Amino acid sequence: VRMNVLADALKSINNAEKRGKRQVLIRPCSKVIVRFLTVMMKHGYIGEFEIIDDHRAGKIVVNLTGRLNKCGVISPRFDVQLKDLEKWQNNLLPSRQFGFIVLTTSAGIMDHEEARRKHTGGKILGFFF
Amino acid sequence: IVKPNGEKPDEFESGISQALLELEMNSDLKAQLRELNITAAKEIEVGGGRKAIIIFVPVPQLKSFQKIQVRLVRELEKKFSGKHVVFIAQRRILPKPTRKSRTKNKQKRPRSRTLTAVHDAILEDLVFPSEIVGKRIRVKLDGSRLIKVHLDKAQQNNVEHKVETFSGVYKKLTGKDVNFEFPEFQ
Amino acid sequence: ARGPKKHLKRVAAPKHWMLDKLTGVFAPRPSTGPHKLRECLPLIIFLRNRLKYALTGDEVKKICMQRFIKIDGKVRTDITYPAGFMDVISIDKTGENFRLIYDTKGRFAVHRITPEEAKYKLCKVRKIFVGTKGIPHLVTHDARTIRYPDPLIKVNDTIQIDLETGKITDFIKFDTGNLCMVTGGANLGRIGVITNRERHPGSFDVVHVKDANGNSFATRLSNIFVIGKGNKPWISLPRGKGIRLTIAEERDKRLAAKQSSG
Amino acid sequence: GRMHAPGKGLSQSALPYRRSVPTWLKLTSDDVKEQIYKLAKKGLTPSQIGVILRDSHGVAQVRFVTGNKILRILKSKGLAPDLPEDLYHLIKKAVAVRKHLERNRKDKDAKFRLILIESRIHRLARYYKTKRVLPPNWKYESSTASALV
Amino acid sequence: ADIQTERAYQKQPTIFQNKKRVLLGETGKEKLPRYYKNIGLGFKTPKEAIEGTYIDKKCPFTGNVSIRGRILSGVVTKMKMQRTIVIRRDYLHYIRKYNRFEKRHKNMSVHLSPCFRDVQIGDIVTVGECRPLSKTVRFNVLKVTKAAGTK
RNA sequence: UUAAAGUUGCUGCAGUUAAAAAGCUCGUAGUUGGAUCUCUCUCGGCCGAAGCGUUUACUUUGAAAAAAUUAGAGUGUUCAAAGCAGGCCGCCUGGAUACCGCAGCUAGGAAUAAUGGAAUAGGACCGCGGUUCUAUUUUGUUG
């Protein structure tokens, strides 16, 4: 069955941008998906997107700008303390100059640098570079 | 006609009751308005100069109000000149319970009393007699959201002159940016 | 073991004694007395290791058996006697008086006092009960049993004791706004004003204390010793005045000293 | 896909975006409920009542008309039966397969289908007992099942 | 007598039942004064202990036991042996090579007082630590809360 | 015996033909599980003392955690491994600090994940009435 809808959301975006496409459809929509997409967008990786209402779990149309190398999910949502973040970013990010790990903390869904600024740990949702 | 919970009417929500008073016994709607009553009134500046009146009515009377809304709005816009009339049901929003709350949340909050649920009903009440056939939310680069609402063409020539007013009401009632479109077909 | 122990190994001795590794295998095991084994300074480690009046442990015995050292007004010839917090050591031959007060690093300081200040000491209150024929009884942190005290004195308070008679001359209650020193834990040797006390019935209370420079810390209620009423201490304070310096501040304060020299 | 079959069919119903009753249907909520009570007294299950209403009276959805569901209406009036309809129809099929199986002892495939049917019965019974619809001591007896049907 | 089903007369030691007062007191009513205490950590004494007539010395509210130590919670599993019950505690143990958890459980025998009536085996009970009451009993029930299927 | 061994693979391996998917299906335990919802009544002189908000998991903080060892600050053992000493012409000065899973204790956060809160209404909130036990203030004290 369909478990971890965010995994399907992130695998669909990765597979379309390998093909050089300009738009991708994501179903079903979810608020974790929307927050993750916003985090990706504010860093200049995807661009504007739009939610379609179905009186159900809606769907999303995302515009692609060709700037994405990889976006992936981590399952299960491991707990990350602020002293164990360096190992995670060494394991997952391609360099110390670019790439982001996306976590969910009690202050919101953010990336690994805003979490360091706010001095908080959380649970790892995924990564993108 | 005005029966607020705070029992405080003033110069402008008394005028709405005054206007309804003549129609009560001087229109064909004789027994279709005796048992109904409004609960609030307001005047709003929209479209850089225009004015729009929102009339708040009890929820249990909503369908009785909008069963005659077409004639009421038609006949209520003749007294005051160049102002759009909008009827909205008075709905309550119960705050989301938290881990630090008072013992007022004794019984579970109904989802009819949810913020999103009342914002999605305020829109339907605002857009009458037309119906909503679609809804889209554009998330833009700065992170802001814009709602795009598709309306039926059956009432297109009846409501399309009020679309600039509809956004003006919704921005203060809700706090959101909304545009209205008329699609091709279903 | 079939009975009580009589030895102490040097690595197992309390760290604030500041004993080196290669002097011997053993350390002085404190005698049984008013203060605990891990919260006391024996007389040998004070006469030999701190004041350097003696070079060996045999010389400490020669000073002691001449009846030169008085601990709170009484001559003690035991060289492992467990002196402790707030005690007064008097050497009449050289005219010296010392009070055992923790410094900011958690170690007993060489704090010299005046002959007038040596006539009293401050004692915490540990137990209050009623004995036969309805006589109230105190028990302090110094293992002093004082009967017929004031009825306003309660547990966790501080009293002043005149060492000649052993009677209470004044007292300070425990309340917010009163000066105190920490006598255990990680804030040992720190001085500050009580600001709050959170109560956990069936468990240990917690007291919040703020320094003069604005630094705040917390301790267990058993580690708090009320010194003075308000900001004014009732005893003379060591050099650091109870303020804990950071390692960077301490480094800068040390480097500034050698530049002054010339 | 299917629970007890390898099929992966997709056929189902597609509700419209309109949650609103159309203007050509003039039946009031109370009149719609009256037909529900009327057809409930002819031994019609809620799913039968729904198709009858849809095919004849132009009632696409009663949740859209009366703001309630058929089983809730029947239970409020007191016309709901003892066992739920889905569990009632599963036990009826188990008796039929088991009744065919005494005249046919060499029918090895009905013996497989009966196992599948009773597994489905146990699944629904577990779900309903967790929901406090069936008493906790309810148990499906392969021999006493005819008493339930 | 229901209260006197054992070979030895059952009474609360603190209570004296033979105060010869007057013939009228005999005529009026025979109801013994009862000893109950306030086992207190914010807990409240049930009213079935102040108004009951049971005699049991290992009850916290009307017996000779003191509550100190640890306050724990569990789920009632079995009620079979006289006047004591078996509860279950479920927890997660962390294995750090795999960065994961595993479910473990403990079965703990506690003493149940007659003041806590109408208790079934599905519900949450708070327990307080006391002195050894038997070979494998050290805790005592302090509060009863009904399970999910609450009536 | 450790690394090499990504040849025990949580990070991180393999199973068409090199070693390897049970003949097939059911089924309990175990593992995993789709959208969905934006703090206050009494008291001590505008604040605190006292109740919790359904309960947790999670995250940050605090105090409590033997020394030695390890990391690390100072210090020309003649250098160094060491040591805890030493420095100035009787004085000056150290003997720091960090780390110390899991479990237990404490205080902030509320995203993620579980859990409950009204459907024979034995529902919430307001004023109203009755049955019973009962407070020991008031009759300067005592009955």
Short mmCIF file of C-alpha atoms in Angstrom, two decimals, chain E residues 7-74:
data_model
loop_
_atom_site.label_atom_id
_atom_site.label_comp_id
_atom_site.label_asym_id
_atom_site.label_seq_id
_atom_site.Cartn_x
_atom_site.Cartn_y
_atom_site.Cartn_z
CA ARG E 7 -10.01 -17.81 62.54
CA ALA E 8 -8.90 -14.64 64.36
CA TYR E 9 -11.10 -11.66 65.18
CA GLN E 10 -10.48 -8.86 62.69
CA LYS E 11 -10.24 -5.29 63.96
CA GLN E 12 -8.38 -2.05 63.39
CA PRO E 13 -5.72 -1.92 66.14
CA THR E 14 -6.08 1.84 66.64
CA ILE E 15 -9.82 1.44 67.33
CA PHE E 16 -11.22 0.36 70.71
CA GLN E 17 -14.66 -1.23 70.41
CA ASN E 18 -15.55 -1.87 74.07
CA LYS E 19 -16.21 1.64 75.39
CA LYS E 20 -18.96 0.94 77.93
CA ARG E 21 -20.82 4.26 77.72
CA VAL E 22 -24.53 3.87 78.56
CA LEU E 23 -27.51 1.61 77.90
CA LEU E 24 -28.79 4.21 75.41
CA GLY E 25 -25.64 3.85 73.31
CA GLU E 26 -26.39 0.14 73.07
CA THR E 27 -29.99 1.02 72.15
CA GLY E 28 -29.06 3.70 69.61
CA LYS E 29 -26.76 2.13 67.03
CA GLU E 30 -23.71 -0.15 66.82
CA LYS E 31 -21.34 1.26 64.19
CA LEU E 32 -17.65 1.24 64.99
CA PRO E 33 -15.59 4.39 64.46
CA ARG E 34 -13.16 3.67 61.65
CA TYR E 35 -9.47 4.49 61.34
CA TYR E 36 -8.53 6.01 57.99
CA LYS E 37 -5.43 8.00 57.10
CA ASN E 38 -4.54 10.48 54.37
CA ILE E 39 -1.97 8.74 52.19
CA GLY E 40 -0.81 11.97 50.66
CA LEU E 41 1.07 12.86 47.50
CA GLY E 42 -1.83 14.76 46.00
CA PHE E 43 -3.83 11.53 46.03
CA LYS E 44 -7.31 11.44 47.54
CA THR E 45 -8.72 8.76 49.80
CA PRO E 46 -11.66 6.94 48.18
CA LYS E 47 -14.96 7.26 50.00
CA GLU E 48 -15.39 3.47 50.02
CA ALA E 49 -12.57 3.32 52.60
CA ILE E 50 -14.10 5.91 54.96
CA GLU E 51 -17.53 4.24 54.73
CA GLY E 52 -16.47 0.61 54.29
CA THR E 53 -16.20 -2.16 56.86
CA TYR E 54 -13.42 -4.35 55.45
CA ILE E 55 -10.46 -5.32 57.63
CA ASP E 56 -7.13 -5.48 55.80
CA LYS E 57 -3.79 -4.35 57.21
CA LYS E 58 -1.94 -3.92 53.89
CA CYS E 59 -4.37 -1.26 52.60
CA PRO E 60 -2.76 2.19 52.37
CA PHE E 61 -5.72 4.31 53.50
CA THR E 62 -6.97 2.07 56.34
CA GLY E 63 -3.96 -0.11 57.16
CA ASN E 64 -0.41 -0.12 58.47
CA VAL E 65 1.65 0.71 55.38
CA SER E 66 3.59 3.82 54.35
CA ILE E 67 3.96 5.03 50.76
CA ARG E 68 7.46 6.19 49.84
CA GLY E 69 9.81 5.59 46.95
CA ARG E 70 8.66 5.39 43.33
CA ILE E 71 5.27 6.19 41.78
CA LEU E 72 4.59 4.04 38.71
CA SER E 73 1.72 3.14 36.38
CA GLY E 74 0.54 -0.01 34.64
#
